[PDB]
Symmetry: C3
Subunit: 367 residues, 3 copies
């Protein structure tokens, strides 16, 4: 039988704790220094309450439908409330319960990205309906497709820690949303919690404390550091001087850009990605016109960018861990593009339905 390795258990639970920390309080403090002061308490409440909600839907049926065996698009309902998962059941080289929690913490941050930006302008019970509709019909299926062995996975999509599942996904939900700064120290601190937590997020994605977890970690430093410089140089060049928000934005942009690529590229490629992601993030927001919904522009643009550049940098040629066998780089790219296209369209269509449903149900705009 497969046996759980206590080291990987230890690593993976510390990593889950760090990804939880990205939401609570990481993204909550990031948005809190951005949104209008009079909406902060309300945003923090909404991010907390929906974080809880997500933890519960995950245990009730979320995990089972994303990770259970099913079809190309969703799993099954045989793990309602973690039924039939023996306590000692092993997944990979860790106990499955730890996989449940690790994966759950990703659902949480994804939702956090959206709720934090939209708390301001959305009626609460509308946010809840929304979270439910979209976590279920979008986050799960896509999780299932990329990581649950569905459509995208079996065509060989490469997304080490959730370019598509987390970022592009949430950026689309957020932008469909949008379609319908007071404390910078606070923003810095949240960016800081995010970055530090993003090590569980990227490294923990290896599922073990091995040399890929190691590669992922070091690429996480390289990319963020490079996206920071690249944002800064660009801000310095366009605006005459760097800025604190420009620096944090830079960091976030490298973190997002490296997310799908961290476990497959050379630190070489990490630093090319960080530069391009930071430049792209800046260029991105610079175009968004036509707050704090720019986050969706950075998450989305940098997610698109990192997902594409994963299909280049993974090459052995370019210092990467190598493409699947029989897979040319030209081909891996089609596949990265197809996964990006599917994520965008899926999240969008469900986003639209989620909001529309809440609207026709409780009304969207706050009372």
């Amino acid at each position: 039988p497969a046996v759980a390795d206590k080291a990987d258990n230890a690593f993976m639970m510390i990593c889950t704790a760090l990804v939880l920390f990205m939401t609570i309080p990481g993204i909550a403090l990031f948005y809190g220094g951005l949104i209008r002061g009079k909406n902060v308490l309300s945003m923090l409440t909404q991010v907390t309450v929906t974080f809880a909600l997500v933890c519960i839907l995950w245990v009730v049926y979320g995990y089972s439908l994303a990770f259970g065996e099913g079809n190309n698009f969703f799993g099954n309902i045989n793990w309602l409330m973690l039924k039939n998962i023996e306590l000692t059941a092993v997944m990979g080289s860790i106990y499955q319960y730890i996989h449940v929690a690790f994966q759950g913490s990703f659902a949480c941050i994804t939702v956090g990205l959206i709720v934090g930006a939209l708390a301001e302008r959305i009626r609460f019970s509308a946010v809840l309906i929304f979270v439910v509709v979209w976590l279920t019909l979008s986050y799960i299926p896509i999780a299932h497709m990329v990581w649950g062995g569905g459509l995208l996975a079996s065509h060989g999509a490469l997304d080490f820690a959730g370019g598509t599942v987390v970022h592009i996904n949430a950026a689309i939900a957020g932008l469909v949303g949008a379609y319908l700064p007071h404390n910078l120290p606070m923003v810095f601190t949240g960016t800081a919690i995010l970055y530090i937590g993003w090590f569980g997020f990227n490294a923990g994605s290896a599922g073990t404390a091995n040399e890929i977890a190691a590669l992922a970690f070091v690429n996480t430093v390289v990319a963020t550091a490079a996206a920071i410089l690249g944002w800064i140089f660009g801000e310095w060049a366009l605006r005459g001087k760097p800025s604190l928000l420009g620096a944090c934005s830079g960091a976030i942009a490298g973190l997002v850009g490296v997310t799908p690529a961290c476990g497959y590229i050379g630190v070489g490629g990490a630093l090319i990605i960080g530069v391009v992601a930071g430049l792209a993030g800046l260029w991105g927001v610079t175009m968004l016109k036509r707050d704090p919904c720019d986050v969706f522009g950075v998450a989305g643009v940098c997610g698109i960018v990192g997902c594409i550049m994963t299909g280049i940098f993974a090459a052995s040629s370019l210092g990467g861990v190598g493409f699947a066998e029989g897979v040319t780089m030209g081909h891996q790219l089609l596949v990265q593009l197809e996964s990006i296209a599917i994520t965008i369209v899926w999240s969008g269509v469900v986003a639209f339905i989620g909001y529309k449903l809440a609207d026709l149900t409780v009304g969207l705009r706050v009372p």
Copy 2:
């Protein structure tokens, strides 16, 4: 001989770091956004200085008297300054020094719960006398009784991470105390540090990175998420709307409620506990009238609740890891009740003596 497993060493030191983080700055920031602005600096000083004091009493004789072999109520003085503990001495499957530190971090948070609430209204040197009297005559014996193999342990009390030792204990000290909000973002952040740190606290309690550490972790998410919803629903129902402090309070209430139960129950039971704990916490504070001493009401009520419900949910029947052999559920409950009753009365009597001593010595009320 028993041999230390490097994975459990690694896990247990990261877990100690997280529990330390619950005090420094977790509970310090929680109280800091609650107490009056003009008392914050002073509270933070007092929580820091007494945290130090506790770290030192722990090394000097704390550990030895709580964990050394003795009687039902206390250990011995054969580990003064960690004497006779060889560096490679192994306890469980980790080096004993790590056990020293893990256990020490619990003493620290327990004291933090009390000092943070009472810094406002207590003369400093009075707080110090108090910490000394009570850590020694109450925290240690009870630690020894529940975890040091004393009275309660050998009657089969179940308390995975310190319902009685930490929470009920400190709630009683705090309430005997009491008997004699300016920055909600700050409060959120401390609640956040607490929650994330509470993973070392609950999972680290398994003493190894095994499947019980895994069960504990996932129950930690389930309960907190559920207590949050349960607090919120109740606040929404009684007050017409949820609130940020109501949400953080919810989280804390699930965390406390799940504390004695995390390593013995099904995620099933976790989520029943989280709901009831969150409802009870709300009901609890709602009765306390007749600030920020409500914390003691939540800690105490939810501690009582989780300790009782551990004697139910541990049942195999109810998804739990099973009661000791020959132990009926009816019996486990008597035992949970007896441990609750003893903790309450013990902490109270020593609390009273601690304060009285400081009063008759330096005067209690601040100059």
Copy 3:
């Protein structure tokens, strides 16, 4: 061949994450509550941008020159961009990539100590030139000398986690710098992040989750707790009352003092060191007159102190792990002194050149 142990991999990556957390946001928030309010945004930007810069110089050639095999003073350029380091290459009992990152995080905090204090009064591009000159001609060589097997190492200098490399080094750079509080809660929080992160820093220094990592951890608690009390008693005695900044300063002073000694002394010696370091820190700053450049006085004085007292407390006699064989205590001291003297003079001479270069290049004082 040497084989990487997954536990040590897991421990060492969590430890790197914690040391990163000491800079981002630990030292950034420490200084941020200290410096003038109108300079905070600018300081935070400068600490972020130079942190990035350091991450990149480290990968490009930093690591290779500090840790590669060379002479007494520097390594080589055979690990440019981590060339020729196979992904599975093992260093000690962890993968080398993890060593790269761990060591990198030390370069980052060291620079953070300096930039945070000097951001106020230094022209930005001047800070960048400086970071480059000094990281390269000072941090690396000294890293190489103490930890890269150079001069100091091979004379048997004892510096477990960087008394000289990190603290004395940066204190000298900072003081040569100097030569040419608004939010105390914020300061507390940064002190808090620092302390918690300092467990990766001290324990991770063992390179494995073993009993020395354990010794280091517990000495980290003992020393900080003792330096806090010692600062406090001294403040209470000289100023009539303890204070929040006096408490945080105390903690920092024990942390610095214990840094070179944590892995070699008895908790006995830890607590003698913490007391003396806290007293010395206070006495130190008390003399500095003739802000927030006192940090350099504490870092420097306490670094000098801990490095000397390592040459005493390591003795078997005094509870320590024992001196090298054939090494008398009298001799170990000469060696501690010689390493202190070399670090001071080296960092100073390069510091001076670094600033002078930036001055003659962009001008030092801000426009």
